[PDB]
Design a protein around this nucleic acid. Structure first.
Ligand SMILES: [Cl-]
Ligand SMILES: [Cl-]
Ligand SMILES: [Mn+2]
Ligand SMILES: [Mn+2]
Ligand SMILES: [Mn+2]
Ligand SMILES: [Mn+2]
Ligand SMILES: [Mn+2]
Ligand SMILES: [Mn+2]
Lengths: 98, 105, 84, 94, 92, 104, 78, 96
DNA sequence: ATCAATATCCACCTGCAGATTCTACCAAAAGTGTATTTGGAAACTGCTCCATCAAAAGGCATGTTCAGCTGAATTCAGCTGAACATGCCTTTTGATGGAGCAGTTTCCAAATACACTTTTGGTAGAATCTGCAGGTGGATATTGAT
DNA sequence: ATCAATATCCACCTGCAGATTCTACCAAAAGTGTATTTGGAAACTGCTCCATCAAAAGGCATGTTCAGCTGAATTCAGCTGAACATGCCTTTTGATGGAGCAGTTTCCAAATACACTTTTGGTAGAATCTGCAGGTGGATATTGAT
């Protein structure tokens, strides 16, 4: 049977999701997460759907940027696979929690 | 009666900009030329972005500008990218870019 | 009301992988997904914290999109589109 | 009821100016309004700070100009200063 | 003239460490600190009042501003000290 | 007699009020807002002074120099965060060497 | 003239930064970065001095410029 | 006598980390400042405090950048910092 | 490892200026008393829009198999960059003086605020119009194996 | 080097959700008269800040030697990607109830606005006090071989 080589479908997906703009995290789970965190901060809070959407936009944008910088960190260590070490480095240089 | 926008030859609302200046507590007094100047600058920047975005929309064969076109416009222009370095455009996405080392050998 | 628990696991592995693909990432370590969940949790915690602070300063019980925008703006992550 | 403000009609006027056969999404228009308000707040903020630095109680077109020089990058700043000075000198001829 | 928080910082210093002096440059650092935190709090409070269309800045705006700007513990102690000073001020 | 005294503070309530209204933040300023603010400033000042003294002489010097301040700010987590993007003049840096750079 | 900032000085800066071993191209690269930094900061500062209708760049102009750059500096007036 | 390569480095590190002094000489730096400012505005003049402030800012910035750079060198299983490292550092920092 | 021989660092005590701290006097805040407005907390209620539910269908998450190629581990040479002695030169200290800015006031024309009245442009709605989303099959393009 | 298997590039069409246009109310410019500051022209003064200029004392440029680190090359276990069967849960789209915004008023606690009055904090001055900033023995640290 047919089979693509490891890495090809990956690049394919990179191009695909770099062409589009839709949110990549599922909506309802994200809403659950937000409501959980918020509830832990303050009880009986209600959200405008707009607020949830804004939160998701900001979140995924942030994660994509962080993934870019992380990828640069992986490439810097003569690697191709990104690692927790890479993310921690990117976070430190950014100054998020150095 | 003439609007100050027409007198200044602007599309952007001079009067509104002036009111926002006074009702924003930036200073107790506001000059007569400040809202005109500011409205002119905002109108110009709006014009530039709408231009580049319009081009990006023509490139992708679309009559209507969407946030994607705005994102392409901002990020492909150096100066607009710098002016909006710490800004996120909703539904914008990113520039198509793959690190060369990742490409098939 | 049904109790909310362990919803950070809602952010599935394929979703994180997609976010990585848009970020131009080709290969992903197995230890990445949990790290991503952690970082995401911190970020979302901070943003939501400031947002709700705004919400209850306005003596409101409903978190508005403007609360989120003000929060993000304060966090240094200005967001266009919901500016209202 | 409720009446909210925006820069929509002006953005659309300018859009029609630069691309007569081009429309704009409500989302994209939202992005634009956010942009205008953001740049507004930046310029006005910087101008406020400068006006405060020199013990002046008035924000004139000069403070706005310097605010633009500080905030906007090269060519963008050039053409912005041009459009501003133009609009002002034209306005003074009431 | 020029006005600074010099004497006040010195008084507080003599409150916490009665037998400890302070360099001039360090006093400059402290002045810069008080100024910066001042502008931060006042700015955040002004934005707070503008968001909710309030035209006055109460101690409430100040408190919320502190909650936003200061990290956990520092924020708590600051809030308590503030409310304390307010109640004591209104006690006479 | 003075607003600062009636609040039991060292920091100038009146001066803070004057600055607040003369800083273009809002049209009106509450009576208790400058009290609250001056209290917060006094507290933060107190914290920094305390830590910077404790650190002032673990180095045998009485006079608090910017170095001691820097040590106090960077050794404390929350103060380090509050002053994250701030440079203390003549403060230097904390003694920190990566273990990787160490021999044997 | 930019070469006034020299190899041993840059080395010392790296030492305070905890750097153990240093490449040769590092010094030139550092001279470049430093040049850019000073260019931006002094640019904004001079802008401030020029709005104030002055010919003497004050410490406060530098402090304002630095703050605007995101490099807040304590101990010079703000 | 001759110290094994890498020890005097650690020595210097400990020293300058324990100190607070400015590391660039005053006059060359001030000359550079006046030169850079001159091509923005003709024959300007500086307070001594302004130049000193500029030097503090510069040295602080460069020290921090060297810290992040050093981290970038460590990350690639190296010890010697390279222009590449500085580049990665400022690129993540958002300066690029 | 703990035997020596450089060098290095540290810790003790001795000591003044280059700074800190503590005082005799003043303009300008800061406080006080007396009226004048007003922002907005309180209350009531019209009205979005938020929470929640149902049901069903297909997108997509999850778990397993399997092996490709990645990253980790190791070896080794070549050359890059640290250590150091060496010698000149640009630094730093520092006394200066001539001056040119910057900071201060005194009048006062020009500009901006304030208050009321007129006018219209901007908005919210509804009526109207049309990109293009989301489907289709068809010719390329790319990738993989043989 | 050639021939499938599959993903991708487009052009086709077209009804509908979203964008555009049209039309009466009305908040907010705009116009006009009059009250209130404002920020630079003349005139001026005293901190700064330069510009030479004479000196030493340290820092740097420089050239030589080599320790060892960087980066190329090779090796291999195991991890992470690709394909798929399985089936769960997130969609989609509707329909509610009602919480709780947000528009409208409605008094008063609290702010502002001058008018005097009192205190303080800022400067230029005396009379303090402390860390450099050397010199010296002893313990560390480092590097080599009785
Ligand atoms: Cl003269
Ligand atoms: Cl010394
Ligand atoms: Mn055109
Ligand atoms: Mn055009
Ligand atoms: Mn109050
Ligand atoms: Mn419709
Ligand atoms: Mn009155
Ligand atoms: Mn001893």
């Amino acid at each position: 049977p047919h089979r693509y080589r490891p890495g090809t479908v990956a690049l394919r997906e990179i191009r695909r999701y770099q062409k589009s703009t839709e949110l990549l995290i599922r909506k309802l789970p994200f809403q659950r997460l937000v409501r959980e965190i918020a509830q832990d901060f303050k009880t009986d809070l209600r959200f405008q759907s707009s607020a949830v959407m804004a939160l998701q936009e900001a979140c995924e944008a942030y994660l994509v940027g962080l993934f870019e910088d992380t990828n640069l960190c992986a490439i810097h260590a003569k690697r191709v696979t990104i690692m927790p070490k890479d993310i921690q480095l990117a976070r430190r240089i950014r100054g998020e929690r150095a | 009666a003439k609007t100050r926008s027409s007198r200044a030859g602007l599309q952007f609302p001079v009067g509104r900009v002036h009111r926002l200046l006074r009702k924003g507590n930036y200073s107790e007094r506001v000059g007569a030329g400040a809202p005109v100047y500011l409205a002119a600058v905002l109108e110009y920047l709006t014009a530039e972005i709408l231009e580049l975005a319009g081009n990006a929309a023509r490139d992708n064969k679309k009559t209507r500008i969407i946030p994607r076109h705005l994102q392409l416009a901002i990020r492909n222009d150096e100066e607009l990218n710098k002016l909006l370095g710490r800004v996120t455009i909703a539904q914008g996405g990113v520039l198509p870019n793959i690190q060369a080392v990742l490409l098939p050998k | 009301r049904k109790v909310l628990r362990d919803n950070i696991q809602g952010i599935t592995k394929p979703a994180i992988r997609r976010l990585a693909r848009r970020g131009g990432v080709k290969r992903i370590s197995g230890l990445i997904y949990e790290e991503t969940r952690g970082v995401l949790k911190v970020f979302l915690e901070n943003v939501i914290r400031d947002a709700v602070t705004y919400t209850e300063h306005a003596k409101r019980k409903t978190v508005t999109a403007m609360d989120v925008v003000y929060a993000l703006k304060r966090q240094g992550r200005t967001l266009y589109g919901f500016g209202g | 009821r409720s009446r909210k403000e925006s820069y929509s009609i002006y953005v659309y006027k300018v859009l029609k100016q630069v691309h007569p056969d081009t429309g704009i999404s409500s989302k994209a228009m939202g992005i634009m309004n956010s942009f205008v308000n953001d740049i507004f707040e930046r310029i006005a903020g910087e101008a406020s700070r400068l006006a405060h630095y020199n013990k002046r109680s008035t924000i004139t077109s000069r403070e706005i100009q310097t605010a633009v020089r500080l905030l906007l990058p090269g060519e963008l700043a050039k053409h912005a200063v041009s459009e501003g000075t133009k609009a002002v000198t034209k306005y003074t001829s009431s």
